[PDB]
Design an enzyme around this catalytic site. Structure first.
Site, PDB file in Angstrom:
ATOM      1  N   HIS A 193      62.033  36.570  34.307  1.00  0.00           N
ATOM      2  CA  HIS A 193      63.487  36.663  34.165  1.00  0.00           C
ATOM      3  C   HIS A 193      64.134  37.458  35.297  1.00  0.00           C
ATOM      4  O   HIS A 193      65.343  37.298  35.529  1.00  0.00           O
ATOM      5  CB  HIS A 193      63.906  37.287  32.813  1.00  0.00           C
ATOM      6  CG  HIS A 193      63.367  36.542  31.636  1.00  0.00           C
ATOM      7  ND1 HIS A 193      63.224  37.095  30.379  1.00  0.00           N
ATOM      8  CD2 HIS A 193      62.914  35.264  31.546  1.00  0.00           C
ATOM      9  CE1 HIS A 193      62.706  36.185  29.569  1.00  0.00           C
ATOM     10  NE2 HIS A 193      62.483  35.076  30.261  1.00  0.00           N
ATOM     11  N   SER A 238      65.080  33.062  28.596  1.00  0.00           N
ATOM     12  CA  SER A 238      65.613  32.413  29.790  1.00  0.00           C
ATOM     13  C   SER A 238      66.851  31.570  29.530  1.00  0.00           C
ATOM     14  O   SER A 238      67.735  31.524  30.406  1.00  0.00           O
ATOM     15  CB  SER A 238      64.512  31.547  30.420  1.00  0.00           C
ATOM     16  OG  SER A 238      63.922  30.609  29.514  1.00  0.00           O
ATOM     17  N   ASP A 260      59.891  16.534  25.094  1.00  0.00           N
ATOM     18  CA  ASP A 260      58.962  17.129  26.049  1.00  0.00           C
ATOM     19  C   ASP A 260      59.685  17.391  27.358  1.00  0.00           C
ATOM     20  O   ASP A 260      60.163  16.447  27.987  1.00  0.00           O
ATOM     21  CB  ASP A 260      57.769  16.217  26.293  1.00  0.00           C
ATOM     22  CG  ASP A 260      56.915  16.693  27.436  1.00  0.00           C
ATOM     23  OD1 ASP A 260      57.302  16.457  28.595  1.00  0.00           O
ATOM     24  OD2 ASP A 260      55.865  17.327  27.167  1.00  0.00           O
ATOM     25  N   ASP A 303      58.192  26.879  32.433  1.00  0.00           N
ATOM     26  CA  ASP A 303      57.598  28.109  31.906  1.00  0.00           C
ATOM     27  C   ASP A 303      56.739  27.738  30.724  1.00  0.00           C
ATOM     28  O   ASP A 303      57.036  28.076  29.571  1.00  0.00           O
ATOM     29  CB  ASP A 303      58.684  29.120  31.501  1.00  0.00           C
ATOM     30  CG  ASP A 303      58.100  30.359  30.817  1.00  0.00           C
ATOM     31  OD1 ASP A 303      56.917  30.668  31.066  1.00  0.00           O
ATOM     32  OD2 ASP A 303      58.808  31.008  30.042  1.00  0.00           O
TER      33      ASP A 303
END
Ligand SMILES: *CCCN(CC[C@H](N)C(=O)O)C[C@H]1O[C@@H](n2cnc3c(N)ncnc32)[C@H](O)[C@@H]1O
Length: 275
Positions: free
Chosen positions: A18, A95, A138, A159
């Site tokens: 971050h 995030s 996805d 991530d």
């Protein structure tokens, strides 16, 4: 209506990633033209810290109130402080909420999250925020379906949890499908270092795509090991902003000294592929 908990929320890996995310977004905001933030593995949005304590105590906790806080980390700590205005760490931004608070009104968020337990919470975090789109799908496929953004400027944040090995392959195959379509955007890939060989394969398979201007930032708590687990984490940034590398050399040493007070590991900023 109930926020998720996370043992790892705000750990050293979170702090690093971050931080890099926040630096890349602020570099994007220097032009008052709009950009997209695509988050492939977005999670719930925020995380109630503790129980009824947690790895945040050895992470965001060691740096967010420090009197000498490097200036480059200010935009990140200011997001954490917005979600903790009592002056006590009781919540940690994800995030997508990093992105929510740093992005302007003209900017765009694309967020994806497959697990039924977080998608609802995430969808609520942008319920009233038209800038974003949240889908339960996805996120590796959002690199083929959402790019390029109309703005033609953006940051993709990949991530993954690396619960399945194939995530060490998927991220490199996904970045290539993203890069074919949007070759000017900044891609940011998080990795954990549990078994370096695994990481070195990934990185070899990433230079083999032929993508250039690839950077690497890594914060290790312990020298590479197999008996230990996640001895490090890092960020591999493609098409980085030009000041990221001098920002991460000015910062990452400080970060390592606060997050790792027992003087183990390393803090490295290198180039996997030059321009
Ligand atoms: C280290 C990754 C932990 N987490 C995301 C953290 C969040 N972005 C933050 O910055 O705090 C992984 C989440 O990804 C979900 N997930 C697993 N697999 C997928 C796919 N294929 N698409 C979307 N999302 C995925 C997990 O359920 C985690 O919540």
């Amino acid at each position: 209506l109930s926020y998720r908990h996370s043992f790892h929320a705000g750990n050293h890996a979170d702090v690093l990633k971050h931080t890099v995310q926040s630096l890349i977004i602020e570099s994007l905001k220097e032009k008052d033209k709009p950009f997209l933030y695509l988050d492939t593995h977005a999670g719930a949005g925020r995380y109630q810290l503790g129980s009824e304590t947690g790895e945040y105590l050895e992470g965001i906790a060691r740096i967010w109130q420090q009197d000498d806080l490097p200036a480059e980390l200010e935009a990140y700590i200011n997001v954490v402080k917005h979600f903790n205005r009592s002056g006590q760490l009781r919540y940690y931004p994800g995030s997508p909420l990093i992105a929510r608070q740093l992005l302007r009104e003209q900017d765009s968020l694309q967020l994806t999250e497959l697990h039924p337990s977080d998608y609802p919470l995430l969808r609520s975090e942008f319920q009233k925020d038209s800038r974003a789109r949240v889908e339960k799908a996805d996120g590796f496929q959002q690199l083929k379906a959402k790019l390029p953004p109309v703005s033609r400027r953006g940051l993709i944040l990949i991530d993954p949890p690396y619960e399945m090995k194939t995530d060490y392959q998927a991220v490199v195959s996904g970045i290539a499908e993203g890069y074919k379509r949007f070759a000017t955007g900044t891609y940011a890939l998080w990795y954990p270092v549990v078994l370096r060989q695994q990481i070195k394969r990934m990185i070899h398979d990433l230079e083999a795509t032929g993508i250039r201007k690839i950077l690497q930032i890594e914060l290790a708590v312990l020298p590479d090991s197999d008996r230990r687990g996640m001895t490090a984490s890092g960020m591999i940034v493609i098409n980085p902003p030009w000041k990221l590398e001098q920002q991460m050399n000015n910062v990452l040493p400080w970060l390592h000294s606060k997050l790792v007070p027992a003087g183990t590991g390393h803090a490295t900023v290198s180039w996997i592929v030059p321009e």
